[PDB]
Design an enzyme around this catalytic site. Structure first.
Site, PDB file in Angstrom:
ATOM      1  CB  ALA B 114     -27.156  20.202  18.382  1.00 42.80           C
ATOM      2  CB  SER B 115     -28.618  17.566  13.683  1.00 47.27           C
ATOM      3  OG  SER B 115     -28.280  18.911  13.393  1.00 47.27           O
ATOM      4  NE  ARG B 116     -23.364  21.081  16.727  1.00 43.92           N
ATOM      5  CZ  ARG B 116     -24.182  21.934  17.329  1.00 43.92           C
ATOM      6  NH1 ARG B 116     -25.062  22.645  16.647  1.00 43.92           N
ATOM      7  NH2 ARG B 116     -24.107  22.084  18.648  1.00 43.92           N
ATOM      8  CE1 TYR B 117     -24.174  19.404  20.136  1.00 49.68           C
ATOM      9  CE2 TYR B 117     -22.025  18.377  19.916  1.00 49.68           C
ATOM     10  CZ  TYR B 117     -22.804  19.504  20.049  1.00 49.68           C
ATOM     11  OH  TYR B 117     -22.215  20.741  20.091  1.00 49.68           O
ATOM     12  CB  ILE B 118     -28.258  12.836  16.499  1.00 50.00           C
ATOM     13  CG1 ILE B 118     -28.975  13.934  17.286  1.00 50.00           C
ATOM     14  CG2 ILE B 118     -29.151  11.632  16.296  1.00 50.00           C
ATOM     15  CD1 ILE B 118     -30.363  14.239  16.777  1.00 50.00           C
TER      16      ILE B 118
END
Ligand SMILES: COc1cc(NS(C)(=O)=O)ccc1Nc1c2ccccc2nc2ccccc12
Ligand SMILES: COc1cc(NS(C)(=O)=O)ccc1Nc1c2ccccc2nc2ccccc12
Ligand SMILES: [Mg+2]
Ligand SMILES: [Mg+2]
Lengths: 213, 442, 442, 213
Positions: B114-118
């Site tokens: 997920a883009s929130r953990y990148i």
DNA sequence: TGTGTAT
DNA sequence: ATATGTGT
DNA sequence: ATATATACACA
DNA sequence: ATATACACATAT
């Protein structure tokens, strides 16, 4: 029946019950308290609207936010629209291009399946003040940027407030626009299956010319 | 209760035109110069803002794509995260501008977290090719804090490869190399014939052959024996699951051949045996054609170059060479603008340093009296000098550390350096500066 | 594949006990010193860091809780966002420690917008009561940058009203008025008997009464005539929908009442008319009791004070008075620590100011031979002098505009006046400073 | 069948097939890359596990994570369990407090309804590395927070990368964990039934008393 | 049956 | 019939 | 953009 | 934490 449809106490009758297809859930969350007891209902539109142009009614109804609208309203896809639950559709969107230029024409194209409604005026667009100003008690309500650009100096001093979308309006402004509406009544010109095939059609070559002239 | 009557026509011409032109010019078509869609420009401007001094910090993508709304972004916040995630991929970027950290996936199995953990940061490539950001144009809107476009040295729109879709127009540019693009820009800058840059798909051990503008991506096999071959490379379009479910499994269904899986940390590697139902005509041309046609290894792609020029209007090109020439011309104009700005700035700096050196020499010689004055008194009695009247507050706003013995010699050396760079800017033309900036790309 | 043997008793005594010890002292019970649960401490610290120069700037909550993880948060990002949204409420907070802008609702309708599409900042109340945060104790964890707890002037735990469940324990504390809490803190400070602070709900038009530990909250009604009345205020637990559909419509259905709304800014007013079925008695006592009970203007709430003390262990207080007494007892020590730190700070500042004044007086006198000296020689000569020995780096690093013949005596007068603030933090005690900071509360 | 569940090639047949019970879908996604497709299974747990002690057998097959766990393994709450689809159950919860103290004991209490599987060794916990460090010339695994301090001074040179969650593990350490498991087999003592009323029971007084010590 | 911080 | 990348 | 389910403890 | 769907164009 269907959730997120705020019912009107006089729905299903012959009076001027109005549905407001607000784009979002925050707009309707603000609307529920400020709306009138009767003649006011709402249904949110989550995300962009499917193009209703060309495909069969059976395949077209397979989208959620067309079955929902055809259930809240009396609009049946393949027959005349006279026995509607409500009386007026009051499409309202944000002030951005995504509102009036994508959702609005898509809804107009979908409603073109019953052209009988347009000359009765029962499909309308609710205006929204793109610019709000509080000059003391005075509430300047500019609905397009051109008015504010042409009226930046006619008034001594004002404090603007850029409204991003329907969630940026205060309860007082929403209530004012909900019982004192500024409606845009949309009527079909002589040719309407010539710009809607142009805009919602598969042939992008017509649009190649359209965005040039 | 106002009921304004407006026709259905002249609605398509005012807002639908507005929305379509907005998608074309400001949503999903990269600019010619910087190669950025405006959302990517917002994301990278916010990333540079977050960098400040500590540019090696790995900020989250929920923070780099969370402060973009005060720079001019209007279209939400969960879409700048994906736009910042796609330019942070470590395997799908031939020339990455955002260096990332997280589960980005790989070519074998292509599925990112997920883009929130990148976590993302501005890469060294951005600081390498992009320059003159403070000489960049200014958007006509006051809210649009980032410039109209950035100023790279090479056309970034070609390196990483782009695929944008707008209303009425769309763009697709295959990933070109950095060496070929740099060589082509060098050729075009010096007024020579421009050689077509070569497609250089990332981490690819295959080869690309252009025929009739239909670039063909091809892998390589290896016949280790008569009934065993080893597929060493497969085209970039495929992943392991798609290859198995689309080609090999069917091949097994045919019963013509049987394959084994030798995939590892490296790229795709397969082994396969052939059964009797598969023809093995000794003529290697027919065998090559058969292996290509039934084992993939051939991907046909075409470019659809469609960019936005420096005037903000759409322009559909037909060859990369013309785009490179137009970019080199526009960048030469902006290089001349940089030259003018730099000569003005260095002239101002040289006057400031000259005044500082003269004042330091006067006080070290006791010409000026420092005891007995005031703020206004000293300012008035020193600003009456015509050559000291240009700067007074900054000129006097230095330290006892500054008015030191050897510090006077240091100020003289600084003035000499200012003069040297002033002559350098006065003499150097656009071509020299542009080739100096071009040769510095790794 | 290796196997080890573990017993369930050891599991519950080692693993589950650690979790039980966690969500009591570390997740959902407020610290008695500052009234912040550990998540709210992170949110407040991040808001403090975000405020910086622009203290009035409204930051988004998604940015307010998108960087608590680097502050020591180990539990996610949405929980901190919700904690900040609850903290930054505008109407439910008696003493808002976070000024909020957004659709927070009101007593009429209680529904925030998204806990991310709202803005929050450090309110003026926080900068008022939370006088000192630098001298707060440091967490034992090396990755917990926010202090162990903040150090407010009055106990803010009972100002707003906390309510937190846990494993084996729970807490529930009623809101209290700022004025009554300040008076109780004063009385506990100077030794007289501490009165019980009164419960004051925000924007509440009713009154509260203490009944043997319980608190009775009563609504207000005024009889317009012997047929109809006006209900002006209702208890804090009742929302518009709950009041309408739970106690108004039920009785209205059985021929009892006929009600209509009068909601506004200071809303929740209702006008009701009595029907024939409602048998009202002319005796005022039983009529008052039956009207209070039937419409439910009477509520009873009991406090369940369980708080994390300074030592970090749970502590149960039977009375709010004991809570305030212990709070002022430990805040006395904390203010004394502040006094000692300010003593050291003023001593250092006085040394610096006197050294600066002496240095300026000496350069004005010309005794210091700054001619023919470098940085090395300057340091060598300056450090030999005892009064310039302590300060070298910043003692000779002022701008020229800082020193002046008139500003020489100006800085001398500043150094002289430094004695006043040196004696301010010396010849006083905890009582005086605490009383002054108590008087500063609006 | 049941979504989010990845099967094996020998499920339902005599083999040491394992059903790993993760606490996140990221762990299952990483497992599907490393899962030996014949001797390994998997199922993720989204939220905190329902406290199953004291509830009736009719109200226990109502939580979805408890229904799917009892359906995948084939466990039946009432009758004896001897026809399991998997030979072993492995809890691969996180290393944080919420995983080791809430999900793990609650799952143990749910599995205690069939005590036999505890003496057979078919229920165990996959210990998860915490203080993975570059000790010496390669990666070194430390399993408890106290073990690091027990051997912190003994390490010549090392780095630190805290494993906040199961998603922070790359494919190499996940491969080492799955293909070279470290199991902890749970054996219930004599007073197991009187130890799950003290934590799962509806009596906060015993919990308070235990927590006091 | 609410009430607030976690998976 | 299908992938690609910003928007609701 | 919203919509999805649990623990815990007192009244 | 994940799951939830559509607009746009053009090769292939
Ligand atoms: C059991 O918990 C969850 C269940 C589902 N769906 S299902 C078919 O298993 O009954 C989906 C999500 C969850 N868990 C949730 C969360 C997990 C981690 C972090 C935040 C979560 N927030 C949730 C909010 C509402 C409902 C479930 C949540
Ligand atoms: C049609 O678009 C949507 C449909 C639904 N389903 S339902 C039964 O509630 O009518 C739900 C959401 C959307 N719209 C979406 C978004 C809308 C605004 C902003 C972001 C959105 N992201 C979405 C992502 C996946 C699916 C739908 C989204
Ligand atoms: Mg918008
Ligand atoms: Mg965790």
């Amino acid at each position: 029946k269907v959730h997120k449809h705020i019912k009107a106490n006089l729905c299903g009758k012959d009076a001027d019950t109005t549905l407001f297809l607000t784009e979002g859930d925050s707009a309707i969350g603000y609307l529920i308290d400020v709306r009138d007891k009767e003649l006011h209902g709402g249904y949110p539109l989550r995300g962009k609207v499917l193009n209703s142009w060309g495909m069969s009614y059976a395949d077209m109804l397979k989208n959620k936010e067309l079955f929902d609208i055809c259930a809240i309203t009396g609009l049946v896809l393949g027959e005349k629209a006279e026995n509607l639950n409500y009386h007026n559709i009051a499409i309202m969107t944000d002030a951005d291009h995504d509102g009036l230029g994508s959702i609005y024409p898509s809804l107009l194209g979908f409603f073109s399946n019953w052209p009988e409604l347009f000359e009765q005026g029962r499909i309308r667009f609710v205006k929204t003040p793109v610019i709000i100003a509080h000059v003391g008690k005075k509430q300047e309500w500019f609905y397009t940027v051109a008015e504010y650009e042409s009226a930046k100096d006619a008034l001594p001093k004002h404090s603007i407030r850029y409204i991003k979308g329907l969630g940026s309006l205060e309860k007082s402004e929403y209530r004012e626009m909900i019982q004192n509406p500024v409606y845009d009544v949309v009527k079909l010109p002589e040719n309407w299956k010539e710009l809607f095939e142009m805009l919602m059609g598969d042939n992008a070559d017509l649009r190649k010319e359209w965005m040039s002239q | 209760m106002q009921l304004n009557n407006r026709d259905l026509k002249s609605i398509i011409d005012n807002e639908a035109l507005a929305y379509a032109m907005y998608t074309v010019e400001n949503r999903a078509i990269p600019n010619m110069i910087d190669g950025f869609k405006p959302v990517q420009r917002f994301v990278i401007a916010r990333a540079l803002d977050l960098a400040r001094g500590n540019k090696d910090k790995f900020h989250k993508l929920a923070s780099i794509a969370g402060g973009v709304a005060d720079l001019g972004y209007h279209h939400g916040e969960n879409s700048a995260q994906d736009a910042g995630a796609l330019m942070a991929n470590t395997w799908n970027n031939n020339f990455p501008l955002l260096d990332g950290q997280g589960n980005f996936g790989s070519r074998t199995v292509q599925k990112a977290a997920a883009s929130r953990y990148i976590f993302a940061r501005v890469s060294k490539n951005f600081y390498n090719v992009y320059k003159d950001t403070e000489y960049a144009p200014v958007h006509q809107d006051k809210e649009h804090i980032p410039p109209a476009f950035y100023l790279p040295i090479i056309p970034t729109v070609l390196l990483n490869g782009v695929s944008g879709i707008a209303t009425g127009y769309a763009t697709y540019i295959l990933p070109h190399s950095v060496s070929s693009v740099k060589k082509a820009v060098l050729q075009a800058l010096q007024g020579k014939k421009v050689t077509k840059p070569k497609v250089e798909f990332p981490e690819f051990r295959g080869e690309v052959v252009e025929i009739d503008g239909q670039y063909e991506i091809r892998g390589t096999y290896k016949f280790t024996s008569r009934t065993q071959m080893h597929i060493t490379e497969i085209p970039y379009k495929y992943d392991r699951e798609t290859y198995v479910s689309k080609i090999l499994d069917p091949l097994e269904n045919k019963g013509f051949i049987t394959w084994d899986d030798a995939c590892g940390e490296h790229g795709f590697g397969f082994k396969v045996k052939f059964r009797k139902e598969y023809s093995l005509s000794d003529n290697e041309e027919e065998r090559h054609a058969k292996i290509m046609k039934d084992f993939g290894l051939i991907e046909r792609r075409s470019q659809n170059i469609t960019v936005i020029n420096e005037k903000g209007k759409l322009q559909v090109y037909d060859n990369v060479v013309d785009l490179i020439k137009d970019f080199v011309e526009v960048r030469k104009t902006y290089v001349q603008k940089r030259i003018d700005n730099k000569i003005k700035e260095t002239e101002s700096a040289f006057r400031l340093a000259f005044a500082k050196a003269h004042f330091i020499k006067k006080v070290i010689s006791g010409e000026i009296v420092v005891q007995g004055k005031t703020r206004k008194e000293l300012t008035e009695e020193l600003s009456k000098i015509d050559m000291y009247s240009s700067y007074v507050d900054k000129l006097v706003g230095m330290n006892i550390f500054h008015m030191t013995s050897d510090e006077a010699k240091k100020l003289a050396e600084e003035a000499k350096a200012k003069k040297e760079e002033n002559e350098y800017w006065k003499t150097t033309d656009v071509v020299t500066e542009y080739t100096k900036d071009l040769e510095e790309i790794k």
